[PDB]
Amino acid sequence: VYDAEFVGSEREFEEERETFLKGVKAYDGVLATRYLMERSSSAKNDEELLELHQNFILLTGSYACSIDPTEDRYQNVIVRGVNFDERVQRLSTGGSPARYAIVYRRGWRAIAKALDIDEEDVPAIEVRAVKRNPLQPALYRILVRYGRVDLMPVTVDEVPPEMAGEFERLIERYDVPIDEKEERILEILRENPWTPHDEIARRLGLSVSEVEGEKDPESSGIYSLWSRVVVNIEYDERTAKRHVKRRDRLLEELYEHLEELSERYLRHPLTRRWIVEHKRDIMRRYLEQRIVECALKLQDRYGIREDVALCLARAFDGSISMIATTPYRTLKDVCPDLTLEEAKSVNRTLATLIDEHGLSPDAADELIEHFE
Numbered sequence: 001v002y003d004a005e006f007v008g009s010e011r012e013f014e015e016e017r018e019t020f021l022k023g024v025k026a027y028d029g030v031l032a033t034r035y036l037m038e039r040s041s042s043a044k045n046d047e048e049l050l051e052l053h054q055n056f057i058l059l060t061g062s063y064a065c066s067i068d069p070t071e072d073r074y075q076n077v078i079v080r081g082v083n084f085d086e087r088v089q090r091l092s093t094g095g096s097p098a099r100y101a102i103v104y105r106r107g108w109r110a111i112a113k114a115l116d117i118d119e120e121d122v123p124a125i126e127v128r129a130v131k132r133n134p135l136q137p138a139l140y141r142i143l144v145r146y147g148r149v150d151l152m153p154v155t156v157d158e159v160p161p162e163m164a165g166e167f168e169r170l171i172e173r174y175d176v177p178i179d180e181k182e183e184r185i186l187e188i189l190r191e192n193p194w195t196p197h198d199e200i201a202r203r204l205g206l207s208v209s210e211v212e213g214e215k216d217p218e219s220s221g222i223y224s225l226w227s228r229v230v231v232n233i234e235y236d237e238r239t240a241k242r243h244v245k246r247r248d249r250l251l252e253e254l255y256e257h258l259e260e261l262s263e264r265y266l267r268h269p270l271t272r273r274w275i276v277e278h279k280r281d282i283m284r285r286y287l288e289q290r291i292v293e294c295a296l297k298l299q300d301r302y303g304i305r306e307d308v309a310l311c312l313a314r315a316f317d318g319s320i321s322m323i324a325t326t327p328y329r330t331l332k333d334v335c336p337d338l339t340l341e342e343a344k345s346v347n348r349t350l351a352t353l354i355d356e357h358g359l360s361p362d363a364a365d366e367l368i369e370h371f372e
């Protein structure tokens with residue numbers, strides 16, 4: 001249920017494969033640094049390691065920005081059964097269905113198939129870091145969706161304050177209009193720019209869909225507001241060029257660094273060779289943490305029964321936001337014991353459509369799938 005066709009030229013194929021494989025290697029660094037951070041307290045409080053982790057988050061984002069530069073190299077990008085070509089074709093600013101997909105958890109599974117990627121196990125690229133993302137997270141995701149290689153920083157030091165804690169400066173810089181709901185979201189982000197979307201939604205009594213919006217200026221929500229801002233920023237090829245030049249060298253340096261640093265914390269240093277060989281373990285430890293955190297939150301903040309909570313957490317790699325924007329049928333198919341009541345608690349869109357607007361679950365599910 002994760003598919004895409006590569007429809008570019010052979011030259012474009014080698015370009016895309018190279019970008020993707022570098023992105024996978026960068027994301028492996030996110031996973032390997034997290035592995036070390038979770039295995040050792042002295043490593044987790046070592047600033048040198050935390051900077052490595054953040055720098056890998058940036059390079060992953062940068063490489064993801066470079067996917068499908070011509071916005072025509074892929075066809076029928078389907079993630080968990082949902083066709084993103086159809087999604088992106090409707091939007092006022094259009095764009096790449098491949099990059100649109102990569103910002104969703106497991107989007108990489110479609111693109112990896114298209115590119116025949118077999119160079120390592122579970123060749124993932126995820127661009128959804130929140131906690132320790134050096135950028136304001138929704139902005140980071142929007143840069144990826146718009147292919148903004150020019151704007152995505154390639155080192156933590158080089159993150160502009162306006163893309164992080166001073167994010168409100170970037171919004172003000174073009175005096176884009178902000179809707180009332182968006183202003184409510186910005187209030188929460190002032191308190192912590194890294195507040196997760198599910199929490200913003202819970203705190204405002206809104207659905208996750210309402211908090212997020214479409215990734216297009218014409219919509220309403222944090223993705224929509226950042227899209228509004230970013231389309232006003234002229235594309236800077238000179239800076240994109242600089243970023244592309246440096247990032248490949250930086251990627252090597254981050255790995256060399258990680259290996260060195262890991263030697264004083266581990267009996268088995270995190271060499272690139274070791275990371276590739278133990279990729280499945282690295283990935284599964286990363287996911288297990290997210291899954292259990294998610295399950296606990298689902299049961300305590302949404303009233304979901306313990307077993308269903310763990311089932312949903314597992315199916316969606318620990319993303320409450322994903323769960324909260326998924327059709328009822330899709331959730332039930334993976335987690336049979338889920339009740340409609342429970343689904344309405346986590347996906348408030350379902351509650352609004354069925355309870356307030358009087359749609360059948362099936363009609364509600366059509367809208368949630370096609371239009372999210």
Ligand SMILES: [Cl-]
Pocket residue numbers: 001002003
């Ligand atoms: Cl599949």
Ligand SMILES: [Cl-]
Pocket residue numbers: 009010011012
């Ligand atoms: Cl060619």
Ligand SMILES: [Mg+2]
Pocket residue numbers: 201206207208209324325346347348349
């Ligand atoms: Mg919701």
Ligand SMILES: [Mg+2]
Pocket residue numbers: 262263264265266267268269
């Ligand atoms: Mg050692």
